[PDB]
DNA sequence: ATCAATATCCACCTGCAGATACTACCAAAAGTGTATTTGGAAACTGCTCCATCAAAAGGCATGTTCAGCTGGATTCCAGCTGAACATGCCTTTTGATGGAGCAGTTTCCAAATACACTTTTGGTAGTATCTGCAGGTGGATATTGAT
DNA sequence: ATCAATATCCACCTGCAGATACTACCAAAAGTGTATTTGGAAACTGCTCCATCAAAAGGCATGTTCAGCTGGAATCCAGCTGAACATGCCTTTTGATGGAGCAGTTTCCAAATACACTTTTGGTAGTATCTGCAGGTGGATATTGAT
């Protein structure tokens, strides 16, 4: 017995993704490749965020990723910021940003 | 003291929110204006959250009720389930 | 009692790949869980409409792929499609 | 003479302080009071999970902070540095939250 | 070869029109707008009903899901009147057969 | 003899068709018998509401035939329909006459 | 001696005229050419249903009219009657089109 | 044969066309730089909608962009359009 | 320029909340294998409608001139709003303590799906005849701008 | 105020595109009836976690004073932008024709679902050890604002 995930070279659970597609009422039928493809996409996007978030942690002299780091990573990244433009990260705060005209002298 | 609950949202707290929003100078009329806006936001979200609570025949408003409410209002929130 | 599924152990797995010496708080793990669920729903949702629009009853990897293209910005889409194609190829050859 | 920072100096200090941090800025109990009061008008005798109230304050504070950003841009557009009610109203109108 | 049928709400929209304005007509472009409207609202309500069922681990969409979906979707007075019309239609439907 | 589910429900809108569209739409595993009745009635009601106001706009313009312009006038002049359809574009609907006061001559 | 309306009189006349009507304001053939040019850069050898081009024009004109409304409010907010690029840009920023 | 090369058709969105659109939007006075700004904003809008529409076309393995392709594209971008088969 | 009052940063330290590593238990989930079924690709091709052409013409775009009045700059000062500081009011903390009610389990029946069969109907096609109103005219009323 | 130039109004009209009418036809849709399956309401209960309570403690909201500097008013003027005009291009309109490719029909099998059975795993619950970093320290030095 060998898992579809290991078979597909993935960390994300192919079987669960398939079951979730079936019970989500998205369609009558789900092809075999669909949950594999979707699982891979979700894993990649997860990797991309964790990479940038980890970097944000190091920049702040931390070794543990917290919500703040996820927000810094997402908002400082053009495409991730667009993808998640209508999303709120709890305990994320905002990017340091002061309009130039408000600076003294 | 007998103060309205919306008045419990204080001038210094609103000031702090504005500061995080990058605001340097605030008109005296902003605080009442902000309270009215805040109340409308809460009314809209809580109305939907409670509607989910009622449908589930519950007496307890759960975080998921709120999360679902925020999502359909276009204010998707990460960190509290779903 | 009962059990509550989440993507936590898989997110953690991926974390060690990209950053072996980096941890993640439970709150941050909650945000990652919300993230994975959200994107799942978006992609599955779009793939569902795609099949319906074309009078098909089956969501295939092709619907997932078009959905990915519709939903992700340029470079993210390119790499997601690449990773998705990679995994379907490797799964087929086994 | 005793020491006094110029008007605006401390304001800028505060902006940098709160943009650096993530803690909620409204006091918890008064917010909890407001929430329960509003919910009572929709359905009496409700209870809240603690996380339900927290989700509400996170969403609400994030919304106001974002609104204040747009409001600030509206004030600056009119060549002011002071935000006013008409700045908030303009931002909300263009956002499509009103009028 | 015959061109396959294209369903629409036109004859039903038209019936309702004659009820509210007996001597008023409607252009085909305006009817096109009305058909889009009905399809749109159908999907919005059905979609919300779908989510609602899923949230509560139910496999059935009943009139109760539709009703809650209507309350979530429609503004004040429209929801109130929609709910009463919907409730009336269901009770009348079950009171027969 | 056979009575339609619409007549049984006292409706003009098609209950049978709405039931079929619910089943084909992959909204849920099962659809209760009351669901398409309730839904058809709501859709019919909203249709009635728009047509009432659109016919009035047509009348106000000395017309007997409703065109998209009248649908747009009816929707945008009604606060609740305007909210419901706030993100909707009505083709050939145009906009409400509205000139900002400050732009008028003194 | 030759008659002249004051600056702004005809502009107001034009606002009343076009707010009264529903016809498309961009010429049809030039808009279709723009659609074909843009599409071609995405994918060669595409054909268009005529109604597809019209749906694009209805959507495009509705968008721009709505955008000019917001732009107008931004100009007026700055105590101007003249819309400028910065009015459009502020409107699109608050809309979240370039935020 | 193939048709003439298509280029610079954004200029087909003329100054009077833009003025007309602004009038319908209630605009009384217009800066000289508005016209180029509007063309740029329009191009971005069109590009985005057409990109999604063609994506639907390709998925259906068609070579013809349909009105429904456009309608679906407008919908998912939150510019829902009535009157073309919604 | 100097100089003093604060803010801000860096290095280091330590208590603990929350992360980790452990074993162990188990129902649900995931895989595997067999039998059955069917969605939708492939092939063929009818027939819609898209691209392209021509050819006339007038609606409307372009480019210009002219100056009204707008936007932008400057100056001024009344007063609003920021900074500081003295009170003391109430949020916060936490730790225990009922008990509401979420949530898990079992029962069982109204209402769901599945299926065979019969009736009905809304969509399309084909022609054939009304009809609301767009658009054109002329003439009376209204609006605007000069004086 | 008077009056002239021009837009706006409304009545009247006619051509016709588009709305309406009717008969024919039929595949799909819809309803009726029967048998079979089952989702989830109902009643009961255990245990999570919500509400409340007391109880300090000090953090933080509030009220007051003082004035720095911001908002808004007023004044000026250079030149942008609107209004009007002449010119003639190219969009619009009409109609035709080839044929691309959308879409309808039927055939057929790779891949789907459906069970039954077996194996694995993720969620869990105690239980114990570990550790990243918040928060407090001192002291260096950077920033601010008065001279
Ligand atoms: Mn090109
Ligand atoms: Mn088949
Ligand atoms: Mn020319
Ligand atoms: Mn001059
Ligand atoms: Mn001015
Ligand atoms: Mn109880
Ligand atoms: Mn019939
Ligand atoms: Mn007319
Ligand atoms: Mn059961
Ligand atoms: Mn003074
Ligand atoms: Mn100033
Ligand atoms: Mn061919
Ligand atoms: Mn395991
Ligand atoms: Mn620290």
Residue numbers in the entry:
A (entry chain G): 14 to 118
B (entry chain B): 21 to 102
C (entry chain H): 31 to 124
D (entry chain A), G (entry chain E): 37 to 135
E (entry chain D): 29 to 125
F (entry chain C): 13 to 118
H (entry chain F): 17 to 102
Paper text:
Furthermore, the N-terminal tail of H4 is crucial for the compact folding into chromatin fibers.
We overexpressed the unmodified H4 protein in E. coli, and used it for the subsequent crystal structure analysis. The crystal structures of the H4-tetra-acetylated and unmodified NCPs were refined at 2.4 Å  and 2.2 Å resolutions, respectively, by molecular replacement as described in the Materials and Methods. Overall, the two NCP structures were nearly identical, as demonstrated by superimposition. In the H4-tetra-acetylated NCP structure, the electron density corresponding to the residues from S1 to K20 of H4 (molecule B) is missing, which is quite consistent with the previous structural analysis. As for the other H4 molecule (molecule F), residues S1–A15 and S1–K16 are disordered and residues K16ac–I26 and R17–I26 are visible in the H4-tetra-acetylated and unmodified NCPs, respectively. In particular, the position of R23 in molecule F and its hydrogen bonds to E56 of H2A and E110 of H2B, in the acidic patch of the neighboring NCP, are conserved between the H4-tetra-acetylated and unmodified NCPs. The averaged B-factors from the three independently refined structures of the H4-tetra-acetylated and unmodified NCPs were plotted along the nucleotide sequence.
